[PDB]
Enzyme design. Structure first.
Site, PDB file in Angstrom:
ATOM      1  CG  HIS A  46      34.285  37.557   6.166  1.00 39.74           C
ATOM      2  ND1 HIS A  46      34.805  37.375   4.981  1.00 39.74           N
ATOM      3  CD2 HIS A  46      35.328  37.662   7.040  1.00 39.74           C
ATOM      4  CE1 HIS A  46      36.100  37.366   5.109  1.00 39.74           C
ATOM      5  NE2 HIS A  46      36.432  37.544   6.354  1.00 39.74           N
TER       6      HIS A  46
ATOM      7  CG  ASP B 213      32.342  37.241   2.363  1.00 39.52           C
ATOM      8  OD1 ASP B 213      31.854  38.082   3.052  1.00 39.52           O
ATOM      9  OD2 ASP B 213      33.450  36.799   2.473  1.00 39.52           O
TER      10      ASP B 213
ATOM     11  CB  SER C 274      38.786  39.411   4.710  1.00 42.89           C
ATOM     12  OG  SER C 274      39.233  38.199   5.327  1.00 42.89           O
TER      13      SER C 274
HETATM   14  N1  LIG Z   1      44.167  32.165   3.247  1.00 48.54           N
HETATM   15  C1  LIG Z   1      43.363  33.033   2.686  1.00 48.54           C
HETATM   16  N2  LIG Z   1      43.195  33.116   1.387  1.00 48.54           N
HETATM   17  C2  LIG Z   1      42.650  33.896   3.482  1.00 48.54           C
HETATM   18  C3  LIG Z   1      42.079  35.045   2.932  1.00 48.54           C
HETATM   19  C4  LIG Z   1      41.356  35.910   3.720  1.00 48.54           C
HETATM   20  C5  LIG Z   1      41.223  35.599   5.031  1.00 48.54           C
HETATM   21  N3  LIG Z   1      40.597  36.226   5.974  1.00 48.54           N
HETATM   22  C6  LIG Z   1      40.757  35.526   7.074  1.00 48.54           C
HETATM   23  C7  LIG Z   1      40.211  35.904   8.306  1.00 48.54           C
HETATM   24  C8  LIG Z   1      40.574  35.240   9.489  1.00 48.54           C
HETATM   25  C9  LIG Z   1      40.028  35.609  10.698  1.00 48.54           C
HETATM   26  C10 LIG Z   1      39.119  36.641  10.738  1.00 48.54           C
HETATM   27  C11 LIG Z   1      38.750  37.305   9.574  1.00 48.54           C
HETATM   28  C12 LIG Z   1      39.292  36.939   8.366  1.00 48.54           C
HETATM   29  O1  LIG Z   1      38.926  37.627   7.225  1.00 48.54           O
HETATM   30  N4  LIG Z   1      41.480  34.442   6.845  1.00 48.54           N
HETATM   31  C13 LIG Z   1      41.765  34.488   5.579  1.00 48.54           C
HETATM   32  C14 LIG Z   1      42.488  33.606   4.841  1.00 48.54           C
END
Ligand SMILES: NC(=[NH2+])c1ccc2[nH]c(-c3ccccc3O)nc2c1
Ligand SMILES: [Ca+2]
Ligand code: NA
Ligand SMILES: [Zn+2]
Lengths: 36, 250, 11
Positions: free
Chosen positions: B43, B99, B198
Site C-alpha cells: 500500500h 500487503d 508503513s
Molecule cells: N497506527 C498504526 N499502527 C499505523 C501503522 C502504519 C500506518 N500507516 C498509516 C498510513 C496513513 C496514511 C497513509 C499511509 C499510511 O501507511 N497509518 C498507519 C498507522
C-alpha cells in the site's frame, strides 16, 4: 537462499558480532519466558 | 512510532527508507532482506482509492540511515529500483490483505556496520516465536503522535496480541495473513507504529541462534496508539512461498 | 525538511 536469508542475516556488526547488547533487546528475550 | 525511543547507531541495519524523487519526501519504511532485495508494504506503492501508483522511476531506496532528513555522507547508500512486484492478491479494496511487495535493486549494496540484511523466518521459527505475549520491535521515521516527526530512527517493543482480541478491536475483517500487536489499555505501557512507518519491519530475536528475524511488515492501524486499538502487520511467513518464488524466478 | 542528496541519484 531464503529460509534464513543471505546465510549472514540477523547478526549486527556493532552488536551480536562484537557480543554487545542494545539497551532493550533484553526486554524481548525476557518476554519469551527467559531466553537463557 | 509513538512512545518509542531513538534507535542506537547500527541497531536496525536492515531498516530502509523509501524516498520519492519529486517532491523529495519519506514515503514508507522497508527492510533489506538480501543485497539486491527490499521488502515493504504494497500500500506504499499502490492504493488506487487515493490515486497512488508509483513505479521504479518515482522511488529511491536509502539504506544505512539514522537521521531522517539528512544525507548521511559516507554512511548511507541510495539505490534505484530495477523492478517492483506487488502480491497478485493484494486486497486494497477491502482490508489490505497480503500487503507485501518486493523491490529488486538496480545494483547490489555492500554491507557495512550500518547496512546488513534481516533474516526471514522458517516454519519452526515462526511457530516458536509468533506467540501472543512475546515482544517484537518496530522501527521507523514515522509520526510521533497521531496529530511531530523525529530527527532520528525510533524504536518501540510491542507484544503480540491473541487473535480474538485483535478481531474484537475492529470492524475490519482480519485474515490469517495479519497479526496485531500492542499493549492492552490495562498494561500501563504504550506504543504503536504510525503514519510514515508503513512498510517497515516488526522483528524478533531468536534465543536459539541469536539472529533477528522479520516476522511482520507494518501494515495498518486505526489512528496511532489509541487505547483499545492495535497495529496490524502482514504475516511474512504465510507469504514466504510468494517471496521465494519471485526471488528464485526473477 | 529533507536536505538535498547528490544529483546523481535522481537522473
Ligand atoms: N497506527 C498504526 N499502527 C499505523 C501503522 C502504519 C500506518 N500507516 C498509516 C498510513 C496513513 C496514511 C497513509 C499511509 C499510511 O501507511 N497509518 C498507519 C498507522
Ligand atoms: Ca543456542
Ligand atoms: Na492501542
Ligand atoms: Zn556480515
Amino acid at each position: 537462499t531464503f529460509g534464513s536469508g543471505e546465510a549472514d542475516c540477523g547478526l549486527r556488526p556493532l552488536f551480536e558480532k562484537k557480543s554487545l547488547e542494545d539497551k532493550t533487546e533484553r526486554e524481548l528475550l525476557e518476554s519469551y519466558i527467559d531466553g537463557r | 512510532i509513538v512512545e518509542g525511543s531513538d534507535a542506537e547507531i547500527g541497531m536496525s541495519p536492515w531498516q530502509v527508507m523509501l524516498f520519492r524523487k519529486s517532491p523529495q519526501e519519506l514515503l514508507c519504511g522497508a527492510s533489506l532482506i538480501s543485497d539486491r532485495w527490499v521488502l515493504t508494504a504494497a500500500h506504499c506503492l499502490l492504493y488506487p482509492p487515493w490515486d497512488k501508483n508509483f513505479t521504479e522511476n518515482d522511488l529511491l531506496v536509502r539504506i544505512g540511515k539514522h537521521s531522517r532528513t539528512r544525507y548521511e555522507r559516507n554512511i548511507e547508500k541510495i539505490s534505484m529500483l530495477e523492478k517492483i512486484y506487488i502480491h497478485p492478491r493484494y486486497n486494497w479494496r477491502e482490508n489490505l490483505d497480503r500487503d507485501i511487495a518486493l523491490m529488486k535493486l538496480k545494483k547490489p549494496v555492500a554491507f557495512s556496520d550500518y547496512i546488513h540484511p534481516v533474516c526471514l523466518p522458517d516454519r519452526e521459527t515462526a511457530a516458536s516465536l509468533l506467540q501472543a505475549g512475546y515482544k517484537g520491535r518496530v522501527t521507523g521515521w514515522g509520526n510521533l503522535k497521531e496529530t511531530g516527526q523525529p530527527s532520528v530512527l525510533q524504536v518501540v517493543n510491542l507484544p503480540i496480541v491473541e487473535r480474538p482480541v485483535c478481531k474484537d478491536s475492529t470492524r475490519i475483517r482480519i485474515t490469517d495473513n495479519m497479526f496485531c500487536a500492542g499493549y492492552k489499555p490495562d498494561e500501563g505501557k504504550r506504543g504503536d507504529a504510525c503514519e510514515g512507518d508503513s512498510g517497515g519491519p516488526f522483528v524478533m530475536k531468536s534465543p536459539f541462534n541469536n539472529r533477528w528475524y522479520q516476522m511482520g511488515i507494518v501494515s495498518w492501524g486505526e489512528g496511532c496508539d489509541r487505547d483499545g486499538k492495535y497495529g496490524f502487520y502482514t504475516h511474512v511467513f504465510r507469504l514466504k512461498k510468494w517471496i521465494q518464488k519471485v526471488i528464485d524466478q526473477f | 525538511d529533507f536536505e538535498e542528496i547528490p544529483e546523481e541519484y535522481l537522473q
